[PDB]
Each structure stands twice: as structure tokens, then as C-alpha cells.
Amino acid sequence: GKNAERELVSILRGEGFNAVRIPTSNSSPNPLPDIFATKGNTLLSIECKSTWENKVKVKEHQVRKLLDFLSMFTMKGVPLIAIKFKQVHEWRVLVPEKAEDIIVTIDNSIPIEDLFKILEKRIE
Amino acid sequence: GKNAERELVSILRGEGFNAVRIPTSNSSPNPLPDIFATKGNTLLSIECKSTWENKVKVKEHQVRKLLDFLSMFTMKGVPLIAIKFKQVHEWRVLVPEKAEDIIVTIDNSIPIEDLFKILEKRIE
Numbered sequence: 001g002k003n004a005e006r007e008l009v010s011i012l013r014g015e016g017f018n019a020v021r022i023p024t025s026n027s028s029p030n031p032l033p034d035i036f037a038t039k040g041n042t043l044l045s046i047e048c049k050s051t052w053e054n055k056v057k058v059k060e061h062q063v064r065k066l067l068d069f070l071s072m073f074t075m076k077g078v079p080l081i082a083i084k085f086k087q088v089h090e091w092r093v094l095v096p097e098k099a100e101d102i103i104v105t106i107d108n109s110i111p112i113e114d115l116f117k118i119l120e121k122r123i124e
Numbered sequence: 125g126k127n128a129e130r131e132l133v134s135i136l137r138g139e140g141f142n143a144v145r146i147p148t149s150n151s152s153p154n155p156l157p158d159i160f161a162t163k164g165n166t167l168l169s170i171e172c173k174s175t176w177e178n179k180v181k182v183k184e185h186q187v188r189k190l191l192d193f194l195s196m197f198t199m200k201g202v203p204l205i206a207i208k209f210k211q212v213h214e215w216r217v218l219v220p221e222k223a224e225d226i227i228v229t230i231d232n233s234i235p236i237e238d239l240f241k242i243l244e245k246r247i248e
Contacts, residue, residue, distance in 0.1 A: 018195075018196045020154055020155060020156065020193075020196070021154060022146060022154075022156065023147060023148035023149075023150070023152070023154070023156075024147035024148040025147075026147070028147070030144055030145060030146075030147070031144060032144065032146065032147075038196045038197060038198075040198070041198050043197070069144075071142075072142045072144070072162045073162060073167070073197070073199065074162075074164070074165050074199055075197065075198055075199065
């Protein structure tokens with residue numbers, strides 16, 4: 001839990017983002033991501049999970065925290081389910097459409113460096 | 125600790141701010157306030173304390189978390205030491221100049237409703 005988050009934070013920082021872990025984000029009511037990160041006018045709101053399976057279920061209640069967090073800010077806000085698929089030694093992300101249950105697989109996620117590219121391409 | 129924060133959050137919400145408590149903001153390194161709040165393009169970064177004394181010392185390390193938090197956002201950012209002076213049954217705030225040790229008293233703080241007025245007067 002703690003270790004994967006610290007790893008993601010370090011990867012975010014090497015991409016040029018300020019990134020910070022939020023500690024007791026528990027099943028509690030508070031709209032807080034596991035990690036938030038900024039670079040310029042972009043804010044990331046991240047649920048962070050690592051697994052040795054090939055899929056991960058994330059619950060509506062947790063996804064909703066990501067979105068409620070973003071809605072409080074006037075920055076460009078991108079919510080992410082960031083998953084370390086340890087089988088392939090890969091960080092992948094899925095951008096949630098809305099607050100619902102989501103099964104993240106290799107097929108519906110992208111490599112995190114692709115996300116970084118999408119953000120750069122928008123800078124234009 | 126928990127109860128004063130929940131009270132401040134409720135007061136913030138009645139002023140029209142989205143406000144959220146951050147749980148394990150401990151003497152730890154993470155730049156996280158006790159509470160953050162937004163309304164429009166303004167973000168508050170708050171260290172929250174209640175006391176039965178007439179002064180409160182806040183440490184540089186804690187003040188710095190407020191500021192490092194704000195510096196990650198492109199919103200208007202106002203750091204606050206929000207103190208419930210229980211002797212007079214009053215929430216007062218001090219806006220820190222910079223990261224240093226600060227002794228908050230009645231004399232160098234203002235009523236929190238005055239802070240709210242200053243923000244409104246700027247909207248113009």
C-alpha cells in the first residue's frame with residue numbers, strides 16, 4: 001500500500017509533477033484521493049493500487065472521492081486509477097468517466113507514460 | 125482535535141466554501157493542512173487549533189506545510205492559522221507571512237468573519 005504509493009509519487013516527481021500522498025484516506029466519507037499531483041494548471045486525483053492479478057475492482061464510493069476532490073478546484077482536473085500490474089511490472093492508468101464500480105484490466109488501461117504524452121500534446 | 129476541526133468545516137460550509145478535513149496530518153513530512161477549503165478560485169490552507177489559553181504557538185515545520193500545499197495550486201491561495209480561543213468562544217485567524225514559529229494571540233489575529241469580509245471585498 002504505502003510502498004507502491006511512494007513509488008508512484010517518485011515517478012510523478014520525475015515527470016515534473018509535485019506529488020503528495022494522503023495518509024488515512026480510508027473507506028471514510030472524506031473526498032480525498034490516495035495521491036494528488038500538480039504540474040502547471042493540471043491537477044491529478046489518483047486512486048493507487050498494486051496487484052499480482054490481471055484485473056482490479058475499484059468501488060464507486062472510492063472513485064467518487066477522486067471526483068468530489070477535483071470538483072473543488074478550478075484547475076484542470078484529471079482523475080486516475082493508477083494500477084501497478086506487477087505481473088508485467090507496469091504502471092497503467094484508467095481515467096474514470098463517472099463515479100461507478102470499475103474493473104481495471106490491461107485492455108481498458110494505458111501505460112502511465114502514454115497519459116503523460118496526452119497531457120503534453122494538449123499543451124501544443 | 126477532531127471536534128474543533130469538524131466545527132470549523134461546518135462554519136466554512138455555511139459561508140459557502142467546500143471544506144474537507146485531512147486525517148493523519150501528523151508531524152510527518154507531507155505538506156498537508158488540517159483542512160483545505162475552496163470557494164470560486166480561492167483555496168484556503170488551514171492549521172486548526174483550539175485552546176483555553178490566550179495564545180498558541182505554531183511551529184515552522186507546521187506552518188510550512190500550509191505554504192508548500194498552496195504552492196502546488198494555481199488558485200488564489202490563503203494560508204490560515206485558525207484558532208478557537210475558547211476563553212472568548214471565538215474563532216480567530218492569522219494569515220502567516222512565511223514559514224516561521226508564530227505565537228497567535230487575540231491582538232495579532234482577527235475574527236474569522238472579518239477574513240470572510242476581506243475575501244468578499246476583493247470580489248468587488
